[PDB]
Write a protein that binds this ligand. Structure first.
Ligand SMILES: C[S@@+](CC[C@H](N)C(=O)[O-])C[C@H]1O[C@@H](n2cnc3c(N)ncnc32)[C@H](O)[C@@H]1O
Ligand SMILES: C[S@@+](CC[C@H](N)C(=O)[O-])C[C@H]1O[C@@H](n2cnc3c(N)ncnc32)[C@H](O)[C@@H]1O
Ligand SMILES: [Ca+2]
Ligand SMILES: [Ca+2]
Lengths: 1012, 336, 342
DNA sequence: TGGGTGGTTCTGGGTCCATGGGCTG
DNA sequence: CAGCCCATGGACCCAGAACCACCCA
DNA sequence: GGTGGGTGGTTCTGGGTCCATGGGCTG
DNA sequence: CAGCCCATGGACCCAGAACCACCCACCC
DNA sequence: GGTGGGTGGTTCTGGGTCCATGGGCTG
DNA sequence: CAGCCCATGGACCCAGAACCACCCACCC
């Protein structure tokens, strides 16, 4: 909408007067007619032209157009006049005949006014696309006052949701005193463990009852279909469960107390009639309920709303692809559709709207099907599709096609036998030959934290198939093809009996993720045409990448990337089309695009998979990146000595993974001591805890129990504190912190011991950015232990290699020396400094940027060799002993705390380390250290040297600012360092880094303009 | 406007302004120069498309001095761009005009360009020049009535060799084209070659008249001959019977030759304009030293009126006519 | 095509649904938008409520007229209310003076197409395939001007011998001016090393007669006078033609060749599609050589390729580029050369 | 007439680490 | 053979900045 | 089914102002 | 001589006002 | 009042040649 | 080594005839 539609209006107004040769209203009025109509068709209204209206003056005033709702109610009006007449003197003439004045766009071909509520809200020039876009926004968004009251009431319900849920929770606690309730509750948890969750817990049945009551009250209060809960199979079952307890004075007690929460919303929803306006309360309840009840279960279910724009685009596109490929149509008999996840019932509510009224009966009765896992969704959905059908046609008819089943587990079996009717339709759906599978599957890879203890429900006969297919062909180490969305994809590739479409909106990871390499190769053998529309929006990125990704198509609620994909399998090769939305784009823009763009007219570049099955980011082959190798898996896994040696190094180390950075690191060893005390002490207490509680993790969450630790406490063995294991280490660029480096508090130590044994070993490591690398390729050489959070996937490349019995034999490969001496007729020592400067070469880091973010940086033989080894020498030494290089002259001034209050002084001693930039964010060479200390004397070359998204200086400043330990046990029950005690040392460290940067810049600057 | 970003145009434009500050009007300004350029580019397109006489410009002395100015910017992509945009106005007229053979039907477009260009571009300059067209009925009547009095008082006809007819203000060329249609074919050749003469001050009128006259002759005779008797000169300034008309070298010859021809009949519709409407317009009538001085000695000196409005452009064109008729003849005019 | 007709049906049902009116004034916006969008693809545009004088002098205003870039009507549309009799309303409107050349008498239910004054096809608007056929015929009706241009192109072929007589006499009368002979001698010697070692003055008079003939029709029938002004090779041959083709010489030749160029120019000016006018380029090409140098036509080869063969050969090279070189004709890097353009 | 006051909505901008699969052993 | 190295992207939220009344100093 | 508004286009048709600016005084 | 008086006729244009055309509403 | 015939135009349709001229021989 | 044999397939076009339109003689 917005610019896209307003720019088409501008072009079509010109072509009317050009092709016709007339500037009269009756001809030129067909340009704004199409602008308004097409805008309305995406907003869910329709501009019907020339509709007569009996006014208070007794005249059937006929305005040029009437914006109307699905309930035939006039919301807005439009009167177009010719450029010849004066708009202002003709508005008065029409308004004096009794023309409506509540929402009317009086418009000439060059000017447009909006008389909202009787007063000109805005007068714009139609030549300016942005101005007209804003005017029409206000016109199509103006709602009558009753609608606005309901809106505010829905907002207020979200505020009261936790409080009414508290009252309902108290009532469910009292239910335990009675044994009649606990009788049918125990029967229910048994019958539910046989159909929904094999691990159904008592708490799960409790939430499932709170849902029956809350939603049962709001199906009589806000909406007026109380009979739904008296005609629904699932409702009747949990109605008995509730009745056993919730009844008589208990029912009345809750009702009277909660009558205040459910009163305001009822008063407002009595005025509203259109279901399309009332269904929005259900969307709010859908999300806010789980927010204020089971947030961890909300993560496992992906309780989210799919904006109507995304659903209407997919429904429209599926129709076009059903004609282009299967010569059929969505409203044709035999094209049955299933939804793997109904949620708030949108993908099927909007299908009802799209389908003709004539063919709506058949499709509703036996050709539209959906599934749901939770109860609130099941109800919210069924209510919606029943009321939508009734509004569109004019007759109420219960939907007999929603089944409450885990679609992933229902693949025989009593999965779905919560009630008899439920299982009847669970097996009926599996019999129906469904052609289209549309939806928004839950996306969940891994889990939030091991402390959260919310793992993904393991799916048998689904992970079985992904293992035989996607994971099989995958060559990546950490295959995250176990995400709930990849499982939903594999289930659907199967559900599709012969030919059809799997149109889903999911994580964009499939388009370009190392783990999903197998999916990219397997899916092309499972489908015939693949159409991907990347909506970008990955906010799990940083720097220029973040701005490029832009806002998320889900109203900036999620942080992952999104992609509307349409996978069609026909009845040659597979045609992989692709269209990414523009970069630096906001959510509103992406959503307006989807609302108006027609699938037919979308530019789709045809991507051709390369040998590595990389659909996107195809590497150039002209570039000669075929030169040596820094490290290759074969060099490391070697037993031939120099036989398979084909690189420059022979040990690939990854930075220590701590898995609990808060407990393993500290600013001073004095604090680490007591931190490791509490941790191991609590583990030693946990191993005494009974085997049962230990196994079920029914313990305390004060310590960050990680995978290995839990299994160690499972052998009930014990640990010990050792102050020798603790050593200084780099976890962040130019920031050294004391680390435990114990096998007990370090989950994955990797091959780091073989570089610096317990930190004692002397070694120089060329740290590298691993593949893939979202942040620009970074490289640095140090002498203290690195972690995986220093550089993106830090891959340390050592100088020497300490062997089993303590022998520091040079790690550097001999093949290199034997391949380098031939080329340039040298010394392994300087060859180390040499490669550092080859990675320091700008043209190399820029021309081969794509290649570098795919594999280990292959090193080109460099003519000079001596000059590169000298370049690298100073560079390496400068970044190793950065702590003691040179105090760059830094102008230091302290400020007074103005009014001498204890607060003012203490406040101006907080960590206010802010880079002072100016105009368009350009550093002015000043850096407030705290409120008092204000540093300066910083050259712009200091800010130029970047070791990632931030500069070498910004990295230091960042880790010198105070933080709030995300770990609650460290946040208050442990240490909280200040900056008023570190300010002096920071000034010194800053000064060193300032010189370090200008020296790096100097060296880098003398490099050739060409790469080999 | 985009052409004034090129030093070559600015150079040629500056040379032209200086040349026309001694040939057309002492105060020829950049505004007048750019009007002339827009007129050249507009007439160029329509004369090749609706009138099928592209050669007109390559045989017209004035057109070749003004194509020098236009050749600096109007060529290649610049011309291809303005052409694709302007085609949406020229399209319809071109289509219908190609199915029309009679030039007497296509001369209605010439009248429209003349009266509407000024009304839309320079309404002020339209007032000082008098951009209006004489209805055919009036023109025809005067041509017939002049022949009547030529036979009554001079025993001659308009077709007789010796009667040199001069139109002091051609406009669209109506008077000369209607004389071509009256004069017999056997005598038209000589008259068109040395006895029909005319003068214009504005460029659009000049081009429109030259084409109208040449094409009316072509339709009647069957062959196309160039009319070498049209001059771009101020009639009330070319009283040198001099640098007036020196826009080009041929135009100066034509002016000096015309001021020696023995004119018998001065037919025409002189411009009329007594005063400017409001002082804020700053569009007063030009001062013509010689004519004004002769009006003062003759018309004004013999008038017993307090207010003299005898410096009207029509009164100035009547004094000139009396003086131009050196011996005998008729001055046939339509005026206030 | 089918897609647009499916959207038409989706709008008609939602106008009577969201608006609750069956009045023609409101239900006509569905077909208006169907025609408007189909037209935008066919290079035409549906202008609405355009008045038109009928034969008896009654201004009639149809509900919409299809206009080309030259602002010329090439089709019409009149919608009525379904609560009526289409055949009865067609007859009354036709009797008011309604054009019958190409008109769709629309009713929310059915639509008839009266082309050439005679019903050609009556369909039901509830059919997405039948309305697509009716509309294809309405938007591909050959107007009178297209047929009268094809007649003129065929007649120009027969009059080319006589037209080339005027131009031959001109090039012969130029061999008396020493300016021409001097330029011709320069051209023959720069074309004896560039085009043919045996370029003769006879070959140069052919290239002149071609430059002159095509430099008149390019400015009249095709309206591209600038082509010759900017073309590299045309500027070299205007330097040889401006030694004689100017002033009264050109005026004489122009007045004697106008009888052969008049008709094509009349018809061509009413055609906007270059695809229609390109049949004249094909006829000038073949017939010039058949009438002037029938022998050189044998040496060079002067037969154009039927478009059906060229379109197949282009579509098939694309299928085969994909199957063998995994590229497409549109992909960057696929350079295509036509050794003998014609 | 800022200014305090005291909230009160827009808005840009980025993490450590779960945890399955090869893999010698 | 089963404990031990590698990976690899991850269904938002949050300081902090206008800005908004809001009297009211 | 006419029939009168509603809306927009398409022809006639009627009907009419303050104020420039040279020349003549004029002192 | 500049600084007062005294004339004297002026190259259109545009708001109603029909009056149609078409068609929704309103009777009939 | 057709009907055949005289006259001129307008589509289709069917149906097919001697002889250039490079290369290998060849005595 | 310059005559002397040996192939080998070729970027259309134009007369019969059909049939059609129009008008004149010819039956009817
Ligand atoms: C994002 S919502 C579905 C979106 C919804 N169609 C919309 O338009 O807003 C995801 C839903 O999938 C449901 N679901 C159904 N079957 C599921 C399964 N097997 N595993 C996980 N979630 C499932 C969850 O209960 C959750 O409510
Ligand atoms: C009424 S128009 C000529 C009308 C002409 N009879 C016709 O039928 O078109 C007056 C014309 O006089 C022209 N003209 C020629 N010489 C002039 C001059 N010295 N002063 C003013 N206008 C002059 C103007 O350019 C203007 O086009
Ligand atoms: Ca209007
Ligand atoms: Ca109609």
């Amino acid at each position: 909408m917005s610019l896209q539609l307003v720019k088409k209006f501008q072009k079509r107004l010109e072509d009317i007067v050009a092709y016709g040769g007339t500037r009269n209203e009756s001809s030129v009025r067909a340009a704004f007619q199409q602008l308004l109509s097409d805008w309305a068709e995406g907003s869910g209204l329709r501009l019907i032209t020339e509709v007569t209206q009996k006014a208070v003056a007794g005249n059937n005033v006929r305005p040029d157009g009437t914006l109307k709702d699905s309930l035939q109610q006039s919301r807005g009006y439009w009167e177009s006049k010719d450029e010849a007449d004066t708009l202002d003197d003709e508005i008065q003439k029409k308004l004096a005949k009794g023309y409506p004045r509540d929402n009317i766009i009086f418009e000439d071909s060059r000017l447009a006014v909006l008389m909202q509520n009787g007063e000109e809200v805005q007068r714009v020039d139609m030549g300016d696309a942005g101005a007209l876009a804003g005017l029409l926004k206000l016109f199509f968004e103006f709602e009558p006052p009753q609608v606005l009251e309901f809106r505010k009431a829905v907002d207020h319900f979200k505020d009261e949701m936790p409080h009414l849920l508290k009252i309902l929770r108290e009532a469910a606690d009292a239910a335990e005193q009675k044994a009649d309730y606990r009788g049918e509750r125990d029967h229910f948890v048994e019958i539910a463990k046989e159909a929904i969750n094999p691990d159904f817990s008592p708490r799960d049945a409790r939430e499932m009852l709170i849902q029956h009551i809350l939603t049962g009250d709001l199906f009589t209060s806000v909406f007026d279909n109380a009979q739904y809960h008296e005609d629904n199979n699932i409702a009747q079952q949990l109605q008995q469960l509730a009745a056993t307890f919730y009844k008589g004075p208990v029912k009345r007690d809750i009702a009277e107390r909660t009558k205040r929460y459910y009163g305001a919303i009822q008063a407002a929803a009595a005025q509203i009639a259109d279901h399309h306006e009332k269904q929005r309360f259900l969307k709010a309840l859908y999300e806010n309920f789980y927010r204020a009840y089971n947030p961890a279960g909300a993560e496992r279910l992906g309780i989210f709303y799919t904006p109507g724009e995304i659903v209407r685009f997919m429904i429209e596109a599926t129709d076009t692809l059903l004609e282009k490929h299967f010569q059929k149509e969505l409203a044709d008999k035999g094209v049955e559709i299933l939804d793997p996840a109904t949620g708030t019932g949108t993908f099927i509510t909007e299908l009802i709207d799209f389908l003709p009224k004539a063919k709506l009966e058949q499709k509703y009765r036996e050709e539209l099907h959906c599934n749901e896992l939770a109860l609130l969704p099941y109800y919210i959905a069924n209510l919606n599709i029943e009321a939508t059908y009734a509004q569109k046609m004019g007759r109420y008819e219960e939907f007999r096609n929603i089944v409450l089943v885990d679609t992933l587990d229902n693949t025989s079996g009593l999965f779905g036998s919560v009630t008899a009717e439920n299982l009847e339709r669970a097996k009926r759906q599996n019999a129906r030959p469904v052609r289209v599978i549309i939806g928004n599957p839950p996306y969940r890879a891994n889990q939030a934290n091991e402390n959260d203890n919310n793992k993904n429900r393991e799916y048998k006969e689904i992970d079985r198939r992904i293992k035989a297919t996607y994971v099989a062909a995958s060559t990546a180490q950490k295959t995250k093809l176990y995400d709930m969305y990849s499982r939903f994809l594999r289930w659907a590739t199967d559900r599709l009996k012969e030919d059809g479409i799997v149109a889903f909106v999911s994580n964009s990871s499939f388009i370009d993720s190392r783990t999903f390499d197998g999916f990219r190769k397997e899916v092309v053998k499972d489908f015939d045409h693949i159409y991907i529309l990347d909506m970008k929006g990955n906010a799990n990125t940083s720097g220029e990448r973040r701005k490029r990704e832009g806002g998320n198509v889900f109203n900036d609620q999620i942080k992952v990337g999104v992609a509307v994909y349409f996978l069609v399998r026909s009845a040659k090769d597979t045609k992989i089309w692709y269209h990414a939305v523009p970069d630096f784009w906001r959510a509103r823009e992406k959503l307006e695009w989807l609302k108006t763009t027609k699938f037919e007219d979308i530019e789709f570049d045809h991507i051709r998979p390369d040998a590595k099955h990389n659909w996107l980011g195809q590497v150039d082959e002209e570039n000669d990146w075929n030169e040596f190798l820094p490290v290759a898996d074969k060099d490391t896994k070697q037993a031939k000595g120099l036989g398979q040696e084909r690189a420059i190094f022979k040990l690939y180390s990854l930075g220590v993974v701590t898995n609990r950075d808060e407990w393993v690191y500290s600013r001073a060893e004095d604090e680490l001591a007591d931190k490791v005390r509490y941790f191991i002490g609590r583990y030693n207490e946990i191993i005494k805890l009974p085997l049962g509680d230990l196994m079920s993790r029914n313990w305390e969450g004060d310590i960050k129990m990680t995978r290995a630790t839990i299994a160690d406490a499972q052998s009930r063995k014990s640990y010990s504190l050792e102050k020798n294991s603790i050593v200084p280490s780099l976890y962040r660029p130019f920031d050294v912190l004391k680390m435990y480096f114990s096998k007990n508090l370090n989950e994955m130590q990797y091959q780091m011991p073989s570089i610096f044994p317990k930190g004692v070993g002397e070694n120089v490591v060329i740290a590298l950015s691993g593949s893939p690398a979202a942040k620009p390729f970074q490289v640095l050489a140090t002498d203290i232990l690195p972690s995986l959070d220093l550089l993106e996937k830090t891959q340390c490349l050592p100088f020497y290699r300490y062997t089993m019995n303590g022998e520091r034999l040079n790690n550097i490969t001999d093949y290199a020396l034997k391949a380098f001496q031939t080329h340039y007729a040298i010394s392994r020592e300087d060859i180390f400094h040499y490669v550092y400067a080859v990675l320091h070469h700008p043209a190399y880091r820029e021309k081969y940027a794509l290649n570098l973010r795919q594999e280990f940086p292959r090193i080109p033989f460099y003519p000079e060799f001596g000059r590169w080894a000298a370049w690298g020498r100073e560079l390496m030494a400068l970044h190793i002993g950065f702590e003691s290089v040179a105090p760059y002259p830094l102008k230091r001034t302290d400020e007074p705390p103005k009014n001498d209050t204890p607060e003012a002084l203490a406040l101006a001693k907080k960590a206010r380390l802010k880079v002072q930039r100016d105009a368009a964010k350009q550093p002015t060479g000043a850096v407030e250290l705290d409120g008092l200390t204000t540093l300066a004397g910083i050259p712009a070359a200091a800010w130029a040297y970047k070791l990632g998204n931030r500069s070498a200086l910004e990295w230091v400043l960042e880790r010198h600012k105070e933080t709030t330990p995300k770990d609650a046990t460290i946040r208050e029950k442990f240490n909280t360092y200040r900056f008023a005690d570190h300010k002096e040392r920071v000034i010194d460290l800053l000064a060193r880094v300032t010189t370090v940067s200008v020296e790096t810049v100097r060296i880098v600057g003398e490099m050739p303009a060409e790469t080999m | 406007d985009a052409a004034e970003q090129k030093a070559d145009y600015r150079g040629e434009r500056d040379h032209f302004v200086e040349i026309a500050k001694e040939a057309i009007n002492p105060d020829f300004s950049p505004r007048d120069a750019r009007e002339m350029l827009i007129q050249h580019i507009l007439t160029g397109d329509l004369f090749t498309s609706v009138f099928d006489n592209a050669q007109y410009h390559e045989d017209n002395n004035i057109a070749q001095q003004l194509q020098q100015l236009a050749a600096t910017f109007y060529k290649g992509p610049v011309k291809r761009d303005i052409a694709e945009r302007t085609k949406r106005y020229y399209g319809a007229i071109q289509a219908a005009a190609a199915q029309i053979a009679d030039h007497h039907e296509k001369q209605r477009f010439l009248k429209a360009l003349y009266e509407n260009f000024y009304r839309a571009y320079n309404p002020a300059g339209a007032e000082r020049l008098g951009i209006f067209y004489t209805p055919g009925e009036i023109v025809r009547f005067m041509i017939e009535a002049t022949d009547t009095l030529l036979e009554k008082h001079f025993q001659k006809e308009l077709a007789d060799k010796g009667v040199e007819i001069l139109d002091p203000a051609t406009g669209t060329g109506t008077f000369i084209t209607e004389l071509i249609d009256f004069l017999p074919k056997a005598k038209l050749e000589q008259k068109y070659r040395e006895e029909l003469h005319c003068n214009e001050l504005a460029l659009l009128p000049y081009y429109i008249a030259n084409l109208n006259i040449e094409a009316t002759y072509a339709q009647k005779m069957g062959r196309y001959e160039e009319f070498r008797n049209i001059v771009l000169v101020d009639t009330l300034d070319n009283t040198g019977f001099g640098l007036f008309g020196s826009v080009t070298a041929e135009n100066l010859e034509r002016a000096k030759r015309q001021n020696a021809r023995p004119v018998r009949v001065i037919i025409g519709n002189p411009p009329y304009r007594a005063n400017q409407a409001n002082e804020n317009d700053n569009n007063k009538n030009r001062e013509y030293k010689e004519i004004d001085r002769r009006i003062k000695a003759t018309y004004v000196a013999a008038s017993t009126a307090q207010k003299t409005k005898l410096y009207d452009m029509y009164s100035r064109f009547l004094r000139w006519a009396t003086d131009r008729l050196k011996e005998d003849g008729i001055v046939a005019f339509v005026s206030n």
